[PDB]
Design an enzyme around this catalytic site. Structure first.
Site, PDB file in Angstrom:
ATOM      1  N   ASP A 299      17.199 111.875  66.850  1.00  0.00           N
ATOM      2  CA  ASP A 299      16.504 112.218  65.944  1.00  0.00           C
ATOM      3  C   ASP A 299      15.628 113.418  65.174  1.00  0.00           C
ATOM      4  O   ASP A 299      14.177 113.507  65.317  1.00  0.00           O
ATOM      5  CB  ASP A 299      14.691 111.025  66.132  1.00  0.00           C
ATOM      6  N   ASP A 380      13.585 113.429  80.880  1.00  0.00           N
ATOM      7  CA  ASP A 380      12.877 114.519  80.975  1.00  0.00           C
ATOM      8  C   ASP A 380      11.969 115.288  81.456  1.00  0.00           C
ATOM      9  O   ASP A 380      11.318 115.987  81.514  1.00  0.00           O
ATOM     10  CB  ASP A 380      12.614 114.643  79.314  1.00  0.00           C
TER      11      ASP A 380
END
Length: 535
Positions: A299, A380
């Site tokens: 993305d 993350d």
């Protein structure tokens, strides 16, 4: 021969059948409202796309018009309404349906039923319609049964010169529909790119891991930009798909890339995290001599100088063990707060969004302790935690070399930017450079309001410094509010190096120091009382 096509439009159920196979059926009670669209190959009758646009809801009609203009002329179009498809059906969409031969499409009204089978560019094969008799009623259900005669195998394919780029195109264009000019007969869009090479590219033998799910339209857009970046090696790219969805991998095949399909082990963000672990292990197994890996999400738009940026900076990673990563992403680099496409920063985080993973960090530290599939933790967020990062920093650009389109951030378009003073990003050298920046910085008056333009002298090219209240390393009270009113990233703290944030305002570089917590509290004159903001 001839396809026997059935299309059923109804208040509560919709379906389409081709030669007795029901290729669409939808009876869901809260989903599937609106105009269902099925596209057939006019020589075989295979479906090449399925869509639904809830044109009872605003703006879904524009998405319908768009998709339909991306369908190649000649394909069989099939439309059927479930429950209601007219309330926000605007006149642009009605005009296009008229142009496709539909008579009841353009007059569609509240809770009407409507079934249509037509070839793009004429003729129409069949149409049925029922008008609702009352506002609290639906039209009668409607079943259209019609023969559509099949085209020759030759009339359905574009006839391109047999460059075997165009074989890859044809393999894609005869299977998937909805991609527009990549399948247009005359003036096809390039599926191969000639990006300018990158002399002395230190990233040449670094694998690119493309992390992908089931959004083939996103992947298509990202891949074009990646393959247009100066210095790409396509054979170093591997697209990792989490699941066996065909259309994402047909997109991989279209560009002639290597794709790996992976059985998802679920759920939610645990499923994403295990896909990342599987992909990074695969990447380093496929390239046993690789010392780093580039990690990219489907993305992102990749900046033209993405690999130029990496090549100039990669030696920081191999030469400075206090660096965690290089990222293309500056969380605070918006169009109004980023300016210099050659400037680099050190930040105490891991921004992701186009980043470089050191092999040793992964194989020796991160892979052995990767969260198990049972933990609903963001991968993350987990690598940013102290026992993973262990104090290290990431290299980021002031102007980001990726752009997140996954649904005003500054995105570099300048080719081949030479980065300025790369070696002063090493741990000790950056501290000297921070001191040298503040010794030259013009202190601002702190009786002013930091949230408004008047806080900085109307100039350009100057470097200014402000000091804000930071009692402890944990204390981002003033910074958070400052971030809001500068209309920057505000939700979690990003952009800090030992209590220093670096930005731009009105094309002036703009240092922020939190005192007394920051070790840079020394360069503050005693005359000045640090600023403080509160919600």
């Amino acid at each position: 021969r001839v396809l026997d096509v059935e299309v059923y439009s109804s208040r509560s159920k919709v379906y389409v059948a081709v030669d007795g196979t029901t290729v669409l059926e939808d009876e869901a009670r809260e989903q599937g409202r609106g105009i269902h669209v099925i596209v057939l190959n006019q020589a075989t009758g295979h479906v090449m796309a399925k869509r639904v646009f809830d044109t009872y809801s605003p703006h879904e009609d524009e998405a319908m018009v768009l998709f339909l203009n991306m369908v190649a002329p000649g394909r069989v179009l099939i439309c059927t309404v479930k429950d209601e498809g007219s309330f926000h059906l605007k006149d642009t969409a009605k005009a296009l349906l008229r142009s496709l031969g539909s008579q009841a499409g353009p007059a569609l009204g509240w809770r009407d039923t409507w079934a249509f089978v037509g070839r793009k560019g004429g003729p129409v094969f069949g149409e049925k319609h029922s008008k609702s008799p009352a506002l609290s009623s639906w039209g009668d259900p409607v079943l259209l049964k019609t023969d559509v005669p099949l085209s020759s195998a030759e009339e359905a394919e574009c006839h391109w010169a047999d460059t075997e780029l165009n074989r890859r195109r044809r393999r894609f264009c005869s299977k998937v529909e909805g991609y527009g000019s990549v399948c247009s007969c005359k003036d096809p869009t390039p599926i191969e790119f000639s990006p300018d090479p990158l002399p002395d590219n230190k990233v040449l033998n670094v694998p690119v891991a493309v992390i992908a799910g089931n959004r083939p339209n996103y992947l298509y857009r990202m891949l074009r930009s990646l393959l247009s970046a100066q210095g790409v090696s396509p054979q170093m790219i591997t697209v990792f798909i989490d699941g066996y969805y065909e259309e994402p991998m047909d997109v991989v095949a279209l560009f002639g890339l290597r794709g790996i399909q992976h059985t998802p082990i679920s759920i939610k963000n645990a499923r994403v995290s295990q896909h990342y672990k599987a992909s990074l292990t695969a990447t380093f197994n496929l390239f046993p001599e690789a010392k780093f890996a580039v990690v990219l999400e489907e993305d992102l738009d990749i900046a033209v100088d993405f690999f130029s940026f990496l090549s100039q900076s990669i030696h920081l990673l191999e030469e400075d063990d206090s660096l965690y990563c290089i990222s293309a992403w500056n969380d605070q680099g918006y169009e109004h707060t980023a300016e210099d496409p050659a400037l680099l920063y050190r930040v105490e985080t891991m921004p992701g969004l186009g980043w470089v993973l050191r092999r040793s960090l992964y194989k020796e530290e991160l892979e052995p302790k990767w969260p198990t599939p049972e933990k609903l933790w963001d991968w993350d967020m987990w690598m940013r935690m102290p026992e993973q990062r262990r104090g290290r920093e990431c290299i980021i650009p002031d102007v980001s070399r990726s752009y997140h389109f996954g649904i005003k951030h500054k995105f570099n378009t300048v080719p081949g930017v030479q980065l300025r003073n790369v070696d002063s990003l090493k741990k000790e050298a950056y501290e000297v450079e921070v001191h040298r920046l503040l010794s030259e910085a013009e202190v601002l008056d702190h009786s002013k309001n930091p949230c408004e333009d008047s806080f900085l002298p109307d100039t350009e090219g100057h470097t200014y410094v402000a000091f804000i209240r930071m009692e402890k390393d944990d204390d981002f009270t003033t910074w958070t509010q400052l971030a809001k009113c500068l209309h920057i990233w505000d939700l979690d703290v990003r952009g800090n190096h030992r209590g220093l944030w670096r930005l731009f305002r009105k094309k002036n570089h703009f240092l922020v120091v939190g005192v007394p917590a920051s070790p840079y509290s020394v360069k503050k004159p005693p005359s000045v009382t640090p600023i403080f903001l509160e919600p």
